[PDB]
Every structure is written in C-alpha cells, then in structure tokens.
Amino acid sequence: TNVISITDGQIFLESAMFNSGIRPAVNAGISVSRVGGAAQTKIIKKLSGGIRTALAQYRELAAFAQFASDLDEATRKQLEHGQRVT
Amino acid sequence: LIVYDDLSKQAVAYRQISLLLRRPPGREAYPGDVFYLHSRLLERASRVSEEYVEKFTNGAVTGKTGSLTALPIIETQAGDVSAFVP
Amino acid sequence: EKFRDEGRDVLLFIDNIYRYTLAGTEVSALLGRMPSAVGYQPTLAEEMGVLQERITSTKKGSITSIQAVYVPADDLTDPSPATTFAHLDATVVLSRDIASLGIYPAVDPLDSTSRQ
Amino acid sequence: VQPNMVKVLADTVVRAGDLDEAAAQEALKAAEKALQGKGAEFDYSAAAARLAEAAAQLR
Amino acid sequence: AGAKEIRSKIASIKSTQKITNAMEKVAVSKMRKAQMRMAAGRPYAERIRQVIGHLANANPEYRHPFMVEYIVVSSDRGLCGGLNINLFKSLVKDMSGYREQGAEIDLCVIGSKGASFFRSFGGNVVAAISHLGEEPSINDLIGSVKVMLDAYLEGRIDRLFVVSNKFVNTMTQKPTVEQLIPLHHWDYLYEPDAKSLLDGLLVRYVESQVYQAVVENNACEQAARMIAMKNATDNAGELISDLQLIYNKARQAAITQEISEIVGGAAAV
Amino acid sequence: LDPLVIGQDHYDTARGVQYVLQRYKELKDIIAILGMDELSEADKLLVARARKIQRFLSQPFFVAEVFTGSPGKYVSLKDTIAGFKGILNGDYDHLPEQAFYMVGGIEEAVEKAKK
C-alpha cells in the first residue's frame, strides 16, 4: 500500500491466471497506468482501445461461457471475441 | 510412571521469576529459554538399555532394562493449540 | 562442504528447518535484541540466507539438500514458512491417503511441485 | 382380453359421480383468489431477466 | 474487532457446509426412488393407448369430442436449481403466442410455487392443488384434471396441455409443454356399448399422462436439488478459505502488537 | 444533512437511499451462498432497486476523461434528487440495471436503455 501511494500505476500478476496457462498473467481488471496514455505511439494507441473493452466484455462471461452457447447472438459474439483476444 | 498435572503452571512460575530477575522477554512475555525448561525435563523420561543398568548398578542388576514414562498435562485456552507453551 | 571440495555431489538432510529458526529466536531473546513481526528475531532473513546460500552447485562439486518443513498454525503466510519458501527449489508432499491404498512412496503427484 | 394375453387395467380409487364431482369442486374452492386480475402480465421481461442473471451468478 | 469473531464465523459456515454435503446424497437417493416410480406407471398408459387406437379405428360410427379440433406442474419446497423459473420462462412464450392469435387462456396449478407466480402478475387460475408429498398418489389429481376436461366438453377450451420438466439425464432437466386432450383383422366382444367404453378410457388416459408428468417433474426436482446443494457446499468452501486468510492476518497482528507493548513497557521500568 | 438546512424532500431522498443500501448489505452472505432466487418478493424488489441506486451514484468526471475517453458530466442538486426519488418510487423498475452506470442525469439513463 505504501509503494502504490508513490508509483504512477501498477501491473498486477494473478496466481489463478498463471496456473490456468495464461503465463503473462497481467490482471487487466485492476492493472492501470496513469501517465502512460500520453506515452503510446499513434498505431498502438488507436488499435489498443478496441481490445481493452473486449477483455472487459469477457470478464463478465468467462466462468459462465460453458453454458452460454444458447444465448442471444450479441452475447455469443462478445464472448467468442473475448476468448480470441484472451 | 510420572504425571506433571500442570506444566503450564510451571512455565507461569518460571516466567514470574525471569521477569522479576529483569531477564529479556519474548512472545507472551516468556524468557528465551522456556523451550529448554520443558525439554530438559521431558527428555529424562526414557527407556535405558541393559548395558546402561549394568554400568549404573556396577553389575548388581543384569539383563534388565529400566524406564520412566511421562504423562504431562497442559491446559489450552478455547482450544488454541498454537499458543507458545502448548 | 569438505566432501563437495573432494569433487563430489553430496546430500545434506536437515531434520527440521523450523527448529533452526526457533533456536535463532531463542538466542536472539537471550541476547536481549528487540523482537520483530510475530515475535521472530530481527535477523530472521539473514540467518536463513547464511545457511541456505552455502548449499549450491560450484565448479568443483555440489551440495543438494532435503529439508523437513513444519508450518506454524497451518498459516503459510507466517514469517518462518514465508522466509524458507524463498530458498526452496522443489516441494515433495507425502499423503496419508496414498499410503492407505498400498502405494509407496506416498508422494502426492498433484500437490508436489518443482521450479525445474 | 386376447387369445394369447389378459390385461387388467385397474383403478387405485373407486370412481363415482359424487367423488368425481366433489374433487373438481374442491379444486375450484382451493383456488380462493380474492382478485383474479387480467393476465396481461407486462412485467415478463423484468422478472425473467432478473432471475436469469441471478441464477447464473450462483453456479 | 479481532481473531475471535472470525473463528466463530468459520465454525458456523463449516457446520452448514457439512449438511449441504449430506443433502446432495439424500437428493440422489430420492431421485432414484422417483425414477423407479416413473417406470412402474408406463405399462398401464401404453396399453390404454393401444386399446383406444383400435376401439376408435374399428368404430367410425362415433367420434369422441377429444378426437377432433394449461396444467402447470411445480414444486412445494425450496432448493430448486432454476427448475420452476426455466418452466415459467418457457410457458410465457406460448401464452404470449396465444395473445398474438387473440385467444383467451385458462390455467390450472399443481404445487405452491406455481400459485405464488400467477398471484404476483395477475394470471387467471381456474383450479389449484398444493402440498403434495414427494411420492404423490393419482387420486389427488382427479379434481384438477376433471375441471380442465369439463372446460373442453363445454367448448371453453380448443386445446389442453401439461407444462412440466422432463428427465433428459441426471444432470439435465428440460422444461416442456405436451398436448393432452386432442390425440387389425378382428373386433372385441364389447360388453357395454363401445361408445360408453371410449368415454371412460379417454378420461383414464389423460389422468395417467398428468400423473406421469407429475412423477417425472418430482424426479427432475430431486436432480435440481442435488445440483443446488452441491453448489451451496462449494460456495461455502470459498467463504471459509477467504475467512481463514483474514484470520491468519489477525493472528499474526495480535502477536506483533503484544510483543511491541511488552518491549515498550520493559524499556521504561 | 438536516431537515432544517436542506429541506424535507432532499433529506427523505437521502434517508431512503441509505435504507435501501443498508438492507442490501445485510443480504450479501445469503445471496452469496443460496443466490437471489431464495429471497422474499419484497427483498427481491428492494435488491433490484439497490443495484440501480448503486450504479446511478457513478459519474464520469472532466478530469477522468484521459483514463477512459468518456466526456465529463456536471449534475445539479435538482436533477440528483429527481433521479434517486424516481428510482425509490419505482418509476424506473422496467429499465435495465446497466443503463444507470456512468450517465450523469436521470434522463440519460432512459436514452442509454434504448441500446
């Protein structure tokens, strides 16, 4: 808590994601960078915005995904895209 | 066979003497040698070989093994076995 | 270390690494030093490092160590287990359930792990 | 009955005009509904979706 | 406050986890009792279907009103893993369809959870039965079934269906709607007239289908209860694990604070 | 937060919001083990309003625009009281729970529900 009060953002690595095969186990849900938004190049800045939302749309459906194949086309496409971005 | 009805009360009496002698306190205010207090006592309860008895009695007793069995008693507080003396 | 210097690979067995930590706590209290978190000695990480850093593989030979570990109050976050786990390379877990089936050795292939 | 098979389709209770009618009347009487309503039930989605989301989180 | 309150919460949740683990095996046991009762009632219904087929084909002189152009089953108790909700969700689709056609709807209720649903949204119930045992008797269904049969003979109902869950497998309960009323070289020695016989057998057939629907729904209920108590046992395990981590933090902090007060007091004396 | 300082309408709206959020906090352990479906018909309605109130309290700021991209919102006291009073009265029971998240004034929750 003291170091979080000094630094300009934190990359959280999660034990559950690492033991699940996702080796670069960055926890997007809570990892943040305060000054870095102004630091990205134009190509990475424009393409990254569409990708962070895809992982957020997956965050709410990931556990439930096994019984989500019979839902509406919107929920199914958001989940299918979320699995590919993950 | 020996019964020590309360080793926890022996530890409390030794803690009192140690604090009154101004010796440095540790966890639960017990002195640094409270483990050695009970260990020095309990390692005497043992079974000794025939050679030990023959050597000790200068050959007066032969072909027999002697022993001291101990049944120490300790009182816990609300089932907490993780306390220092227990 | 003498056997290692003869050009050999050696096994060092430590009956219990928790008792090594406790003996350090007892000596630190006898010397009057100010206690640290959870009542351990202030030198806890240095006393563990001085012992564990000699156990290594060198240009002449090596010392490999098997150390029995006791966990206080079943709390893996306690300073003694936490300081010890920073030096370990593998964890072998023995299961009472596997021994009941007649299998020996009673290692649990799911709970046991290695950095290798 | 058939030359190679005999089937008896029995009844668990003794049917009869009074027993047959009484149970039907008792099933009307048991549906003692002060206010019947209309049946429009426009809250369908608001109730179905609430329980669909709640039932998913539990497993 | 500290470690003492957390230790009491852990013991409380652990005591609850032990019974939900036992209730899963009790639900499996009762599921098997319901499955044997489902099989025991099949021979009677298939034979009544075989008699009505010949007794109608061979007698073109008479057509019963049931041969020319909802009863809802629900539980009486808690711990159902979406069983009743998935059934009402499936029913509302067909009731809405009948209102697109502009047709009026009559409803019959079996079980306490079904009565509460229609009462919370204003549904018109014509008949209702409740508080039946886990092993029901066909004589209790006669009343609710007759009111629905009479409404057909009075011309108030064009089609009648039974709404209930079907046992696909021990891990899958399917909500369904089944039509009830609208269904070779020798002839029988009809003792009474063949018309009198057809009138009685069609009534026995519909009651038997409702009884089979009720017994299969009870098998689906015990299977749903098994999953719900398995989930409750697993959910309690996650809460126990989190509380144990919070307890260990409080255990370590209490020892550190006591040692700080003893060292602080002995530095002054 | 006193009737003699802010008036009865504001005071009762604030007290109503706190009562709903307090009752929702008491049900958290029951909902975690058995789920929402076991609650009474009264508790189910209160939990649904508590979830909407909790989301309507959120607001995009003009200094937070760099973090996400969304434009900031300034909401007057009049608009604040009107939104929470309507949710407490049940005037928005039909709108979806995600329509209240990050929308400034109550009218924007009605437009967000159209998607």
Element (H, E) at C16: none
Q: Nearest residue of E to residue C76 by CA position?
A: E248
Q: Could you give the CA distance from residue E92 to residue F70 in angstroms, rounded to a whole number?
A: 39
F65: left (phi over 0), alpha (psi -120 to 50) or beta: alpha
Residues of chain D with C-beta less than 8 angstroms from the C-beta of F91: none
Q: Could you give the CA distance from residue E105 to residue E111 in angstroms, rounded to a whole number?
A: 20
Biggest alpha carbon–alpha carbon distance for chain D: 62
Q: Could you give the CA distance from residue E181 to residue E148 in angstroms, rounded to a whole number?
A: 10
Secondary-structure percent of chain A, ordered helix, strand, coil, rounded to 5:
50, 5, 45
Q: What distance, in Å, lies between the first and last C-alpha atoms of chain C? A: 24
Q: Nearest residue of C to residue B33 by CA position?
A: C26
**Nearest Cα to C107, choosing from C79, C55, C66?**
C66
**Residue E223 CA: distances (Å) to CA of C18, E33, E85, E168, E170:** 49, 12, 15, 11, 6
Q: Is A52 tagged catalytic? A: no
C-beta atoms surrounding C23 within 10 Å: 13
3 state SS for chain D? CECCECCCCCCCCCCCHHHHHHHHHHHHHCCCCCCCCCCCCCCHHHHHHHHHHHHHHCC
Cβ–Cβ of F67/A37 closer than 8 Å?
A: yes
Residues of chain D with C-beta less than 8 angstroms from the C-beta of F96: 49
Q: Could you give the CA distance from residue E25 to residue A83 in angstroms, rounded to a whole number?
A: 36
> Distance (Å) from the C-alpha of residue C10 to the closest C-alpha of chain B?
32
| Contact of chains E and C by CB distance (3 or more pairs under 8 angstroms) | yes
**Residue B68 CA: distances (Å) to CA of B42, B46, B48, B65, E81:** 10, 5, 9, 11, 63
- C-alpha angle E242-E243-E246 in degrees, rounded to nearest 5: 95
Long-range contacts of E243-246 (CB under 8 A, 24+ apart): E243/E6, E243/E9, E243/E10, E243/E13, E244/E10, E245/C77, E246/E6
Sign of CA dihedral F33, F34, F37, F38: negative
Cβ–Cβ of C78/E248 closer than 8 Å?
A: yes
Q: Please give the radius of gyration of chain F, using alpha carbons only, rounded to the nearest integer.
A: 16
Q: Which of D50, D55, D57 comes nearest F48 by C-beta? A: D50
| Contact of chains A and B by CB distance (3 or more pairs under 8 angstroms) | no
Tokens read off for F79: 């608009």
In three-state secondary structure terms, C13 is strand
In whole angstroms, what separates CA E190 from the centre of its chain? Answer: 41
E185 close contact with D: CB closer than 8 A:
no
In three-state secondary structure terms, C91 is strand
**Nearest Cα to C67, choosing from C7, C116, C21, C1?**
C21
Q: Could you give the CA distance from residue C29 to residue B25 in angstroms, rounded to a whole number?
A: 7
DSSP letter assigned to residue C70: -
Q: Could you give the CA distance from residue A33 to residue A40 in angstroms, rounded to a whole number?
A: 11
DSSP letter assigned to residue F113: T
- C-alpha angle F12-F13-F14 in degrees, rounded to nearest 5: 90
Residue given tokens 């002195």 in the structure block: B31
Q: Could you give the CA distance from residue F63 to residue B76 in angstroms, rounded to a whole number?
A: 58
C-beta atoms surrounding D29 within 10 Å: 11
**Nearest Cα to C44, choosing from C68, C67, C28?**
C28
> Distance (Å) from the C-alpha of residue E241 to the closest C-alpha of chain C?
12
Tokens read off for A58: 């997956």
Tokens read off for E211: 């009884």
- C-alpha angle E235-E73-E97 in degrees, rounded to nearest 5: 100
Residues of chain F with C-beta less than 8 angstroms from the C-beta of E120: 41
Residues of chain C with C-beta less than 8 angstroms from the C-beta of E256: 37-39
Sign of CA dihedral E175, E180, E186, E192: positive
Method: cryo-EM
Tokens read off for E113: 């959870």
> Distance (Å) from the C-alpha of residue A38 to the closest C-alpha of chain F?
9
Long-range contacts of C67-74 (CB under 8 A, 24+ apart): C67/C13, C67/C14, C67/C16, C67/C17, C68/C14, C68/C15, C68/C16, C68/C17, C69/C16, C69/C17, C69/C18, C70/C16, C70/C17, C70/C18, C70/C19, C71/C18, C72/B82, C72/C18, C73/B82, C73/E248, C73/E251
A49 close contact with F: CB closer than 8 A:
yes
Q: Could you give the CA distance from residue E27 to residue E30 in angstroms, rounded to a whole number?
A: 5
Burial of C58 (0-12, 13-18, 19+ CB in 10 A): exposed
B28 close contact with E: CB closer than 8 A:
yes
Residues near D54 by Cβ (< 8 Å), separated by ≥ 6? F35, F36, F37
Torsion of CA B19, B25, B29, B30, to 10 degrees: -80
C88: left (phi over 0), alpha (psi -120 to 50) or beta: beta
The pairing of strands B2-4 and B70-72 is parallel
**CB environment F64-95: b (16+ within 10 A), e (fewer):** eeeeeeeeeeeeeeeebbbbbbebbeeebeeb
In degrees rounded to 5, what are phi and psi of residue C35?
A: -65, 155
Q: Could you give the CA distance from residue E114 to residue E214 in angstroms, rounded to a whole number?
A: 13
Q: Could you give the CA distance from residue F56 to residue F112 in angstroms, rounded to a whole number?
A: 12
C-beta atoms surrounding E256 within 10 Å: 16
**Nearest Cα to E206, choosing from E142, E110, E156?**
E142
> Distance (Å) from the C-alpha of residue D39 to the closest C-alpha of chain E?
4
Q: Could you give the CA distance from residue F57 to residue E121 in angstroms, rounded to a whole number?
A: 30
Which chains lie within 8 Å of chain D at 3 or more CB pairs, if any? E, F
DSSP letter assigned to residue E72: E
Half-sphere exposure at residue E195, Cβ-oriented, CA atoms within 13 angstroms: 6
Element (H, E) at E167: strand E161-169
Identity of residue E105: I
Identity of residue E16: T
**Nearest Cα to B84, choosing from C39, E8, C48?**
C39
Identity of residue E137: S
Q: Could you give the CA distance from residue E183 to residue B30 in angstroms, rounded to a whole number?
A: 88
- Identify whether the C-beta of residue E109 lies closer than 8 Å to the C-beta of residue E123: no
- Identify whether the C-beta of residue E127 lies closer than 8 Å to the C-beta of residue D30: yes
- Identify whether the C-beta of residue C64 lies closer than 8 Å to the C-beta of residue C58: no
Q: Could you give the CA distance from residue E126 to residue E180 in angstroms, rounded to a whole number?
A: 17
3 state SS for E192-237? CCHHHHHHHHHHHHHHHHHHHHHHHHHHHHHHHHHHHHHHHHHHHH
- Identify whether the C-beta of residue E228 lies closer than 8 Å to the C-beta of residue E75: no
**Residue C60 CA: distances (Å) to CA of C3, C52, E221:** 10, 18, 71
Residue given tokens 């630190």 in the structure block: C28
Q: What distance, in Å, lies between the first and last C-alpha atoms of chain B? A: 22
In degrees rounded to 5, what are phi and psi of residue B73?
A: -115, 135
B27 close contact with C: CB closer than 8 A:
yes
Q: Could you give the CA distance from residue B31 to residue B38 in angstroms, rounded to a whole number?
A: 13
Residues near B76 by Cβ (< 8 Å), separated by ≥ 6? B83, B86
Tokens read off for E142: 């006669």
Tokens read off for E244: 């144990």
**CB environment E24-40: b (16+ within 10 A), e (fewer):** beebbebbeebbebeee
- Identify whether the C-beta of residue F109 lies closer than 8 Å to the C-beta of residue F92: yes
**Nearest Cα to E258, choosing from A38, F59, C38?**
C38
Half-sphere exposure at residue E101, Cβ-oriented, CA atoms within 13 angstroms: 9
B27 close contact with E: CB closer than 8 A:
yes
Interface of E with C (CB under 8 A): 245, 248-249, 251-252, 255-256, 259, 263
3 state SS for chain B? CEEECCHHHHHHHHHHHHHHCCCCECHHHCECCHHHHHHHHHCCCCEECHHHHHHHCCCCCCCCCEECCEEECCCCCCCCCCCCCC
In whole angstroms, what separates CA A44 from the centre of its chain? Answer: 16
Q: Please give the radius of gyration of chain B, using alpha carbons only, rounded to the nearest integer.
A: 18
Tokens read off for E80: 């159902």
In whole angstroms, what separates CA E152 from the centre of its chain? Answer: 26
Residues of chain F with C-beta less than 8 angstroms from the C-beta of D56: none
F96 close contact with D: CB closer than 8 A:
yes
Name residue C63's beta-bridge partners.
Answer: C10
Q: Could you give the CA distance from residue A53 to residue F49 in angstroms, rounded to a whole number?
A: 27
Sign of CA dihedral E168, E169, E175, E179: positive
Residues of chain B with C-beta less than 8 angstroms from the C-beta of E262: 25, 29
In three-state secondary structure terms, E265 is helix
C-beta atoms surrounding C83 within 10 Å: 19
> Distance (Å) from the C-alpha of residue E68 to the closest C-alpha of chain D?
24
Identity of residue C91: T
- Identify whether the C-beta of residue C62 lies closer than 8 Å to the C-beta of residue C10: yes
Q: Please give the radius of gyration of chain A, using alpha carbons only, rounded to the nearest integer.
A: 15
State this model's resolution in angstroms. 2.8
**Nearest Cα to E228, choosing from E79, E76, E74?**
E79
DSSP letter assigned to residue C33: P
Q: Could you give the CA distance from residue E70 to residue E179 in angstroms, rounded to a whole number?
A: 9
Tokens read off for D29: 């009487």
Catalytic residue selected from A23, A34, A52, A59: A34
Identity of residue C62: S
Torsion of CA D18, D24, D27, D32, to 10 degrees: -90
Identity of residue D52: A
DSSP letter assigned to residue E168: E
- Identify whether the C-beta of residue F98 lies closer than 8 Å to the C-beta of residue F55: yes
Q: Could you give the CA distance from residue F25 to residue F44 in angstroms, rounded to a whole number?
A: 13
Residue given tokens 């000790």 in the structure block: B56
Q: What distance, in Å, lies between the first and last C-alpha atoms of chain A? A: 29
E79 close contact with D: CB closer than 8 A:
no
Identity of residue E229: M
Cβ–Cβ of B27/C32 closer than 8 Å?
A: no
DSSP letter assigned to residue C107: B
In degrees rounded to 5, what are phi and psi of residue B72?
A: -70, 145
Cβ–Cβ of B27/E259 closer than 8 Å?
A: yes
**CB environment B65-78: b (16+ within 10 A), e (fewer):** eeeeeeebeeeeee
DSSP letter assigned to residue E163: E
